[PDB]
Design a protein around this ligand. Sequence first.
Ligand SMILES: CC(=O)N[C@H](C(=O)N[C@@H](Cc1ccccc1)[C@@H](O)CN(CC1CCCCC1)NC(=O)[C@@H](NC(C)=O)C(C)C)C(C)C
Lengths: 99, 99
Amino acid sequence: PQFSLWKRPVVTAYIEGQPVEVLLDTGADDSIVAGIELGNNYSPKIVGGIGGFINTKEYKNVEIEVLNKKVRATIMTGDTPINIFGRNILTALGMSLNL
Amino acid sequence: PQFSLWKRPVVTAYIEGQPVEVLLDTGADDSIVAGIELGNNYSPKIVGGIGGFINTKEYKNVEIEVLNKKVRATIMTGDTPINIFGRNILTALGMSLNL
Ligand SMILES: CC(=O)N[C@H](C(=O)N[C@@H](Cc1ccccc1)[C@@H](O)CN(CC1CCCCC1)NC(=O)[C@@H](NC(C)=O)C(C)C)C(C)C
């Protein structure tokens, strides 16, 4: 699949079965999602962006189904306006940015 | 050429002749650079990301050179920790995200 970038590269992903719309983001080191419950196996983490920092709960080894691929990766939950799938997930998928 | 994403996709871009390191960012709608004084013909804007909003100054038709490609694009200056080339510049360069 090729994303031309004329529109936001958004797809539907399944995180432990829960469907979520995420943005494929090359400018994010991590993945952060809002609105899903993942349980008690987390450590609190601080993540910084353009307007400042935010607290998140970091879950490691979460099962993710996206673009017909299945991967286990770290996911953070927190107050984000858009669900982000950063490089930790993009590299696992084998996705690249081409010029 | 391709960016495999194991590392942040960073390049040296020349903006109106000045070299600057920028992050190629598919999760960004706009481009925001710090430390470039382009004059007073800009439009005041506000851009939001993780953590909140920042005030930016938008300039149109700015000369940008990346890996020997030259385009004129819209660019914003503002207090950003990292310089970002968002989708408006990535499309102008013909970049795409592939799997
Ligand atoms: C609306 C929009 O496109 N905002 C962009 C933006 O903040 N994009 C974020 C993801 C995003 C978009 C919209 C709403 C909320 C979040 C992302 O693509 C770019 N930023 C770049 C950061 C990098 C660290 C220094 C400051 C700039 N990435 C992040 O915020 C991520 N942080 C890190 C460290 O990777 C975070 C999502 C995990 C601006 C750069 C123009």
